[PDB]
């Protein structure tokens, strides 16, 4: 993704990790087509919510601009209004 | 399962996990030999064991159950009174 | 089921409840067609291994000869050598 | 294993890798005595379902006629009808 | 498993889960028919899949595996060069 | 459980819930004899670390004084020094 987008993700990775239920967020990204089943399984393997969230963020960090928007949209639509705002500025 | 059917299952991920009723679905799946009984016990225990977690694992595992897994799965939906969900699926397959 | 069978099951009930891990028995029995999914969901809703086993036994108590054989065969097949030995003399005729 | 069998595996490898849920196959093969625990641990160590399937097939390609049969049987027994069908014509004579 | 042996595995919980090496143990347990292959796969996936989590599930599940489960378990420890843990258990059982 | 002990638990249940890895703590209580396999499974069943910890605390509230000391010792020996101090006063 664009540099500003990636950086934006880095800035808020911690807040994101702590709060998000990864399974719901991945549900959206799967539907959108910006996450694979194998990637989803990789994420789910992680033994804690935080490590699951951390892994997803790691994968997203290596994905394209659409993936960032998918992610943002997932947050917004699942009611993570505050976290969505944090990344709003970085939307490519 | 062909790529188009798999893709369909991913596209409908949100709707499936939001609406799929599983408790009533197992008999149907068995009748059409979509899953073995132990496979069902494993799916039942997926994640937290909520309806949503079971549903999600079901539809993921479904991708591995054969060339006709998707149409057979729609039928089981029909058989258990989940016509609305089956309808959402079919109108995509065709679309 | 015949009284010999039921009685044998009742006599060794506590041992059975202590040891059985239902996930390795209910699958066989469902395959064999002598336990329902609805019964399996009821069992699964018990929070502990022993409670699961207990429920399962109650359900088998009320069942037929073929069922006892299904159960016994599952126990034997899943390495519950000791438990199977307890029920052995209680096995009934089937066709 | 015979070249017929091995080439059958090679031909259908991609289909097999996409669908096989190794946890339902490795058990049978271990029971049958044609897969070792250390091979199973090596398989388990792969992070995704398809990666595990890929590893398992890698291992099986190197095994004997009996092993192929063990594999085929487990596939059939676990409801992978389509996959077994792909492997049917490649079954080697055993014993 | 009798009450005294069950009590023993509980008393020694901390030491077992701290020290038990499981990757090398599976073959022993199978040779002595203590667990079926699929039970082993399940134990391997217990909790986080750590050595400790596997070990913990192993010993809990051990309690259900029969009258000779403990002595057979100790033998598998010895088989796999975990003699210090086996000795720890051994001495306790006689005391 | 004594009164002052039960109350001191209630007092710090939130901080406890937040930090403890229940599985290690239960390992200690199982060894000590103040937790059953059945109870441990009940705890394990809970879908999250916090809920696991919550369940454990719920159970301990219904146990005797030794059960509390077992719990106290579990925390100490697993390096939860601060958490242990909080509970120190309530020791029957
Ligand atoms: Cl994929
Ligand atoms: Cl107990």
Curated annotation (Swiss-Prot), chains A, F:
What does the record give as the function of this protein? Oligomeric Apaf-1 mediates the cytochrome c-dependent autocatalytic activation of pro-caspase-9 (Apaf-3), leading to the activation of caspase-3 and apoptosis. This activation requires ATP. Isoform 6 is less effective in inducing apoptosis.
Protein name per its UniProtKB record: Apoptotic protease-activating factor 1
Q: Where is the CARD domain?
A: 1-90
In terms of the parent sequence, the fragment covers: 1 to 92 of 1248
Expressed, tissue-wise, as follows: Ubiquitous. Highest levels of expression in adult spleen and peripheral blood leukocytes, and in fetal brain, kidney and lung. Isoform 1 is expressed in heart, kidney and liver.
Q: What is known of its domains?
A: The CARD domain mediates interaction with APIP.
Highest taxon of the lineage: Eukaryota
Subunit-level organization = Monomer. Oligomerizes to a heptameric ring, known as the apoptosome, upon binding of cytochrome c and dATP. Oligomeric Apaf-1 and pro-caspase-9 bind to each other via their respective NH2-terminal CARD domains and consecutively mature caspase-9 is released from the complex. Pro-caspase-3 is recruited into the Apaf-1-pro-caspase-9 complex via interaction with pro-caspase-9. Interacts with APIP. Interacts (via CARD and NACHT domains) with NAIP/BIRC1 (via NACHT domain). Interacts with CIAO2A.
Induction context = By E2F and p53/TP53 in apoptotic neurons. Translation is inhibited by HNRPA1, which binds to the IRES of APAF1 mRNAs.
From the Swiss-Prot or TrEMBL record, state where the protein is found: Cytoplasm
Q: What else is known?
A: Physiological concentrations of calcium ions negatively affect the assembly of apoptosome by inhibiting nucleotide exchange in the monomeric form.
From Swiss-Prot, chains B, E:
Q: What sequence ranges are listed for the domain CARD?
A: 1-92
Query: What does the entry state regarding organ or tissue expression?
Result: Ubiquitous, with highest expression in the heart, moderate expression in liver, skeletal muscle, and pancreas. Low levels in all other tissues. Within the heart, specifically expressed in myocytes.
Modification comment: Caspase-8 and -10 can also be involved in these processing events.
Would you identify the family this protein belongs to, as annotated? Answer: Belongs to the peptidase C14A family.
User: Quaternary structure?
Assistant: Heterotetramer that consists of two anti-parallel arranged heterodimers, each one formed by a 35 kDa (p35) and a 10 kDa (p10) subunit. Caspase-9 and APAF1 bind to each other via their respective NH2-terminal CED-3 homologous domains in the presence of cytochrome C and ATP. Interacts (inactive form) with EFHD2. Interacts with HAX1. Interacts with BIRC2/c-IAP1, XIAP/BIRC4, BIRC5/survivin, BIRC6/bruce and BIRC7/livin. Interacts with ABL1 (via SH3 domain); the interaction is direct and increases in the response of cells to genotoxic stress and ABL1/c-Abl activation. Interacts with BCL2L10.
What function is annotated for this protein?
A: Involved in the activation cascade of caspases responsible for apoptosis execution. Binding of caspase-9 to Apaf-1 leads to activation of the protease which then cleaves and activates effector caspases caspase-3 (CASP3) or caspase-7 (CASP7). Promotes DNA damage-induced apoptosis in a ABL1/c-Abl-dependent manner. Proteolytically cleaves poly(ADP-ribose) polymerase (PARP). Cleaves BIRC6 following inhibition of BIRC6-caspase binding by DIABLO/SMAC.
User: Would you tell me the protein name for this molecule?
Assistant: Caspase-9
UniProt lineage: Eukaryota, Metazoa, Chordata, Craniata, Vertebrata
Give the gene symbol: CASP9
Measured against the full-length protein, the chain present covers 1 to 95 of 416
Swiss-Prot record, chains C, D:
- Please state the span of the N-terminal signal peptide per the UniProt entry: none
Q: Which residues form the CARD domain?
A: 1-90
Instruction: Provide the protein's localization.
Output: Cytoplasm
The transmembrane segments are none
Its induction, per UniProt? By E2F and p53/TP53 in apoptotic neurons. Translation is inhibited by HNRPA1, which binds to the IRES of APAF1 mRNAs.
Tell me the tissue specificity: Ubiquitous. Highest levels of expression in adult spleen and peripheral blood leukocytes, and in fetal brain, kidney and lung. Isoform 1 is expressed in heart, kidney and liver.
What the protein does? Oligomeric Apaf-1 mediates the cytochrome c-dependent autocatalytic activation of pro-caspase-9 (Apaf-3), leading to the activation of caspase-3 and apoptosis. This activation requires ATP. Isoform 6 is less effective in inducing apoptosis.
> Further notes on this entry?
Physiological concentrations of calcium ions negatively affect the assembly of apoptosome by inhibiting nucleotide exchange in the monomeric form.
Q: How does it assemble?
A: Monomer. Oligomerizes to a heptameric ring, known as the apoptosome, upon binding of cytochrome c and dATP. Oligomeric Apaf-1 and pro-caspase-9 bind to each other via their respective NH2-terminal CARD domains and consecutively mature caspase-9 is released from the complex. Pro-caspase-3 is recruited into the Apaf-1-pro-caspase-9 complex via interaction with pro-caspase-9. Interacts with APIP. Interacts (via CARD and NACHT domains) with NAIP/BIRC1 (via NACHT domain). Interacts with CIAO2A.
Domains (record comment): The CARD domain mediates interaction with APIP. The monomeric form is autoinhibited in a closed conformation through a bound ADP at the nucleotide binding site. Exchange of ADP for ATP and binding of cytochrome c trigger a large conformational change where the first WD repeat region swings out, allowing the NB-ARC domain to rotate and expose the contact areas for oligomerization.
What protein does this entry describe?
Apoptotic protease-activating factor 1
Q: Which residues of the full protein are shown?
A: 1 to 95 of 1248
